[PDB]
Structure 1
Amino acid sequence: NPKFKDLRAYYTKPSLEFKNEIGIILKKWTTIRFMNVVPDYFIYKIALVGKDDKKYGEGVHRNVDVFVVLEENNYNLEKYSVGGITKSNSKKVDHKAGVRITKEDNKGTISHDVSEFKITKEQISLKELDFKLRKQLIEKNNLYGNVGSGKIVIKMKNGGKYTFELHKKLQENRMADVIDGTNIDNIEVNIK
């Protein structure tokens, strides 16, 4: 009940997608480092968390895509987002993955729904997957209305999996983890 409010608000935030941009990293001036992205005359500050800190050194980084979710921060920054950095596509991707949703309402009834998640990137961040999928589950399945727990599992063609626990926000460090979008096989969602 109480926890759903915060999650529903976060996962209904607006997002932005920047592709084929350049990232600019200057000397560390605070506790976390940032990649600056300037698509159209405003500077986006992307926190470098988890694996991204060692992945991007000072200087210019070409072929950068960013999945952006602006949010509040303790650094006094106006256009701040965490993770979501990937390598731009070498060429167009036109792929898709079936989503299988099992939901048990607050009355015990078990239902099923299906959707198709469209994949247009070779490399996709767990940030993007987690965010887009939860937003879809809120809009179409009322996630965080009556029920707000369970899991999203991204199943890969090689047998790998990536799990997002629905009762809390995706851990920040994992927002920088990236996977092969073309190798996503299907997605399983269980809400309870």
Structure 2
Amino acid sequence: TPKYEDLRAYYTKPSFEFEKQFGFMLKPWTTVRFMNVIPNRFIYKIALVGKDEKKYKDGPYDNIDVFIVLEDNKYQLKKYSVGGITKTNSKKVNHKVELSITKKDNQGMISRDVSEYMITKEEISLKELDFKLRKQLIEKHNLYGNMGSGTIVIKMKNGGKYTFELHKKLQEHRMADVIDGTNIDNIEVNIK
């Protein structure tokens, strides 16, 4: 059967979260543009992919939150990330959503567990949902040990849904997509 070393490695990387930040653009040096953020002793460069290229103009953009995962890249930039830019919270959010997980092991044995997942952002990137949920599946359910396929489905109060396919990384352009965190109703996971 197949291994999933690359996915387990990616989704166990540390993540960084920076809130109420000032995002700024410098003169473009390549086709892809990058928002800069300096929350500490480092300058982080966030690639504007998918919807973000048209979303952000010259800037600056204050009152933003960024979800950062440091990626390997062709420029050997040490602090480079993709997507994950959202509007900062107007107030505190502690929104509970049901998380149901079904897992089928290699012997065909099925398990289930239901828990609560806390949404703490008004506006949340698919990047942050995908990354933190997969890390939790690895840590609590051994995702990418024996099994590495299936889906995470984010189900919305308005009937919308967002699907993350577990057998591959989230498509880069989708890391820029953002959704109303307060409108998430429940999350269904199926591992096989």
Q: TM-score, normalised by structure 2?
A: 0.98
Q: Take 1:163 and 1:6, find their aligned partners in 2: how far apart are those partners?
A: 20
1:46-79 deviations in whole A, cap 9, x for unaligned? 0100000111112310111000101111122110
1:2 offset after TM fit, Å?
4.1
Q: Take 1:99 and 1:42, find their aligned partners in 2: how far apart are those partners?
A: 35
1:97 aligns with 2:97: yes
Alignment of 1:118-157 (within 5 A): 118-157=118-157
Q: The residue matched to 1:121 in structure 2 has which SS?
A: coil
Q: The residue matched to 1:63 in structure 2 has which SS?
A: strand
Q: Take 2:153 and 2:65, find their aligned partners in 1: how far apart are those partners?
A: 24
Q: Take 2:76 and 2:10, find their aligned partners in 1: how far apart are those partners?
A: 19
Q: The residue matched to 2:66 in structure 1 has which SS?
A: strand
Q: Take 2:58 and 2:29, find their aligned partners in 1: how far apart are those partners?
A: 12
Alignment of 1:22-171 (within 5 A): 22-171=22-171
Q: The residue matched to 1:59 in structure 2 has which SS?
A: coil
Q: The residue matched to 2:133 in structure 1 has which SS?
A: helix
1:31 offset after TM fit, Å?
2.4
Tell me, which stretches of 5 or more residues in structure 2 are unaligned?
Answer: none
The count of corresponding residues between Structure 1 and Structure 2 is 192
Runs of 4+ in 1 over 3 A off after TM superposition: none
**Counterpart AA for 2:112:** H
1:11-68 deviations in whole A, cap 9, x for unaligned? 0000000000010011211121000000013100001000001111123101110001
CA contact (8 A) 1:98 1:116 kept: yes
| Change beyond 3 A, Cα 1:74–1:3 | farther
1:80-136 deviations in whole A, cap 9, x for unaligned? 011000000111111121110000001100110122211111000000000000000
Q: Take 2:72 and 2:159, find their aligned partners in 1: how far apart are those partners?
A: 37
Q: Aligned residue for 1:173?
A: 173
Tell me, which stretches of 5 or more residues in structure 1 are unaligned?
Answer: none
Q: The residue matched to 2:136 in structure 1 has which SS?
A: helix
1:160 offset after TM fit, Å?
0.5
Q: Take 2:23 and 2:2, find their aligned partners in 1: how far apart are those partners?
A: 39
Q: Considering only aligned residues, what root-mean-square deviation do their CA atoms show, in Å? A: 0.9
Q: Aligned residue for 1:7?
A: 7
**Counterpart AA for 2:36:** N
Q: The residue matched to 1:28 in structure 2 has which SS?
A: coil
1:161 offset after TM fit, Å?
0.2
Q: The residue matched to 1:114 in structure 2 has which SS?
A: strand
CA contact (8 A) 1:153 1:164 kept: yes
CA contact (8 A) 1:26 1:59 kept: no
**Counterpart AA for 2:124:** I
Q: The residue matched to 2:90 in structure 1 has which SS?
A: coil
**Counterpart AA for 2:24:** I
